Structure 1
Amino acid sequence: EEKEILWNEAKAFIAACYQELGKAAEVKDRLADIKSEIDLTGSYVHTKEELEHGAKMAWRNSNRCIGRLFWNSLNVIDRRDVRTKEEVRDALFHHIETATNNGKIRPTITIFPPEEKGEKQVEIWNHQLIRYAGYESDGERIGDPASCSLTAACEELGWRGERTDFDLLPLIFRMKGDEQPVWYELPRSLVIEVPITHPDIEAFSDLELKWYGVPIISDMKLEVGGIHYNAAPFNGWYMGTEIGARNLADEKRYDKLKKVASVIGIAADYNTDLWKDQALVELNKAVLHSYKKQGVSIVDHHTAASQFKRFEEQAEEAGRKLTGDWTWLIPPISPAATHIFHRSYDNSIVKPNYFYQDKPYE
């Protein structure tokens, strides 16, 4: 009965995947073998090629992603073999090292064993493999509020943060069978961080801002042909606005705009001065400059939008329908200056794809 759903999702997926791979003739016999595998086992196992291509399609179908031009160059690491928490740990460490690539970031995904009966083999608690802790107590606020609750959950497990504004959270995950997750401190040698400086306002370094090099999302499920890879962390490189216009700017995040206005020498008293907008622009210029100066990959929202226009053009030529979420595709800074703002996008969900799933805590 769920053997049903799996089979249909498998037919749809294998047909399209083998088609795109020029292997249309092998569809029939591969489906045959799958049809039997589901019967006996209650599931089927992807070939390395299907799994690599599915992860690529899934990125291609991510409506909210402006970076999709490069879907076909995704570096897929197949780690369906892992059985131990040491192996998971070492896999997660490797992912960080290989994706980082000394600053020249490789979009990469590491794929762990999929859910069995909706039962997770590996359950990752981090939202990104590399994220900063957040604390709030007695009015006091330190670090990244977005991480307050995961931070409290790590501190239930005998971890303790130093309470700087940029404590690296440990990796934390649970193995099937275990009642509590384990946690491992990140080796600082693996984590590139970028101090934020401004191209020509030297006082900007007084803010003592920094951010980490690589956003590695670890809380989404990759679904491919009815197989549910709940643990499959992936990374791109940052678009500068994500850091400069949100992580560092939002009132519910680091909330730095007033501090930025002060070091850039402008008043923060009157809305009509547009001081927040000016602060946002200088902060965002600073972030791109710092990543570039440090030789860590990053893209500005204008170039990103240009690439996405190429993605739109490439999709039409291949005869693929384009889907997209206008509300996430527009950048949070000068959106009307990108072509994205001035057109609309069909927000339909096509599979394979990445999906939200609930965290264990919270």
Structure 2
Amino acid sequence: KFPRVKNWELGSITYDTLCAQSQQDGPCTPRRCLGSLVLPRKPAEQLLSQARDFINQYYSSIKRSGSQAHEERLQEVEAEVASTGTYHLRESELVFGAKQAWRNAPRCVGRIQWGKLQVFDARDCSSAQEMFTYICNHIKYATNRGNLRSAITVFPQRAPGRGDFRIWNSQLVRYAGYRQQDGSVRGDPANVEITELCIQHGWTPGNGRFDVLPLLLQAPDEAPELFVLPPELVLEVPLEHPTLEWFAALGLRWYALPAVSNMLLEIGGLEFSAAPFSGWYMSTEIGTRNLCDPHRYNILEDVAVCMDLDTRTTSSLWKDKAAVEINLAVLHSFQLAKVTIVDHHAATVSFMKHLDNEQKARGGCPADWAWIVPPISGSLTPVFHQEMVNYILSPAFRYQPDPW
């Protein structure tokens, strides 16, 4: 019933009682574990239950649980669903759901910050045009000249009649990927499809490796519309190396703001199909995955040749050496440009602190080991040695289909 959970470095044991609050099945069965899969294979009575449970969550969180205001709020929601099929959240309830969805996210190592989230209410949005204004204000706020501040902006919820509000881009800042005659890619290979969708809805493309993409924003049942982000709003960091001089000449750079924009926010049964959120980068996201993945910018080889390493054989560990400097370069450059970054040691240490905090607060913390453990130097970080239970709690961020 309740899983024993051991840290292998310290020999300490806890018991997860929180997982008993899960009400959504993940992918695993007793016959086989599917925990390393990235995606899943994927009614008034049931909306009422999710809503009840979430309002309960809310009033508990403000300690007014059971009181008059709590009863009256449960009545409003019920009366509203029975009549209309749906309901709406109060701004304060929303703010709480957003924080909580972040707190519940098993794949996020940055959760120590969960209580500090600026929530922009954009539920009074009726056009791609308005979406764009809200998106620009979010970016300005979040960026704050390099002093990054966590933020979410919440667009109008999904409804029975109509199409969704959608940001088509997976992130608010993305570099173009250009498919070439010879089938190779200029720019970021991850963004091939979105680059092409932009061109098709009328974008004049560049030809660089680091061209910031426009936004395709979709108001309900309408064609998506194209919006260019003003260049001065997209803070970028040119990459250099503390001791390696040539490195700067590789012309590498990355943007400051990691802002997820294709994920669905679910609160109390209500669904928010456009609810972009941002914090700040952990350097291994840029240094290791975005620049070193073979199906990304794939720069290892370039770098190692520049370092004059023996590229001929795996056992010289040239890949491990190059990766280490590229990560160092990212940290150096962000520090130099006074933009917020966290290294993977600092981040995982504070994740451990968060795990402890959550054990005392809620009796557990849903966590996805494969995603929490950094993509270089796993066992050198404390999370490697930590056993973790993965389950789904609501409020949640979920994946959702692409709108095309």
Which category of TM-score, normalised to the shorter sequence, fits these structures? Answer: over 0.9
Query: Once the 2 structures are TM-superposed, how far is the Cα of residue 118 of structure 1 from its aligned partner?
Result: 7.5
1:210-251: CA deviation from partner (whole Å, max 9, x where unpaired): 000101000000000000001000001000000010000011
Partner of 2:101: 58
CA shift for structure 1 position 56: 0.4
Determine the C-alpha separation between the residues in 2 that align with 1:187 and 1:324: 37
Q: CA deviation at 1:38?
A: 0.7
How many percent of aligned residue pairs carry the same amino acid?
A: 42
Q: Distance in 1 between matches of 2:364 and 2:239?
A: 40
- Do residues 15 (structure 1) and 56 (structure 2) align? yes
Q: 1:237 aligns with which of 273, 280, 287?
A: 280
Aligned partner of 2:353 among 307, 310, 319: 310
RMSD after superposition: 1.1
Q: Which runs of 5+ in 1 are unaligned?
A: none
Equivalents in 2 of 1:55, 1:215: separation in Å?
17
Tell me whether 259-268 or 29-38 shows the greater mean CA deviation.
259-268
Could you report, residue by residue, the CA deviation over 1:292-332 in whole angstroms, capped at 9, with x for unpaired residues?
10011010000000110111111112134211000101000
In 2, the alpha carbon distance for the partners of 1:344 and 1:126 equals: 34
- Shift of residue 121, structure 1, vs aligned partner: 4.1
Letter in 1 for 2:203: W
Superposed CA deviations along residues 117-157 of structure 1, whole A, max 9, x for unmatched, are 28444121010011001011222420101000111111111
Does the 8 Å CA contact 1:120/1:230 hold for their aligned counterparts?
no
Q: Are 1:40 and 2:40 counterparts? A: no
| Structure 2: distance between partners of 1:319 and 1:50 | 20
For 1:118 and 1:52, locate their aligned partners in 2 and report how far apart those are by CA, in whole Å: 26
Q: Determine the C-alpha separation between the residues in 1 that align with 2:214 and 2:113.
A: 30
Match of 2:198 among 150, 154, 176: 154
Query: Partners of 2:259 and 2:300 in 1: how far apart?
Result: 26
| 1:165 is the counterpart of 2:209 | yes
Which amino acid in 1 is paired with 2:97? Answer: G
Residue in structure 2 matched with residue 291 of structure 1 by the alignment: 334
Distance in 1, matches of 2:265 and 2:307, equals 43
| Contact map agreement 1:203 1:264 (CA 8 A) in 2 | no
Equivalent AA in structure 2 for residue 306 of structure 1: V
Q: Name 1:222's counterpart in structure 2.
A: 265
Q: Give the distance between the partners of 1:128 and 1:155, measured in 2 at CA.
A: 17
Residue range with higher mean Cα deviation, 21-30 or 281-290: 21-30
Determine the structure 2 residue equivalent to 1:177: 221
Q: Distance in 1 between matches of 2:201 and 2:362?
A: 51
Which position in structure 1 is the counterpart of 2:178?
135
Q: Deviations over 1:164-209 (max 9, x none)?
A: 001111011111131x210011100100010010011111112110
**Alignment partner, residue 281 of structure 1:** 324
Cα separation, 2, equivalents of 1:49 and 1:23: 14
Aligned residues: 359
- TM-score, reference length from structure 1: 0.97
Please say which of residues 38-47 and 209-218 is displaced more in the overlay: 38-47
Amino acid at match of 2:61: E
Equivalent residue, structure 1, for 2:121:
78
| 1:112–1:292 Cα change, 3 Å | same
**Structure 1 counterpart of 2:26:** none
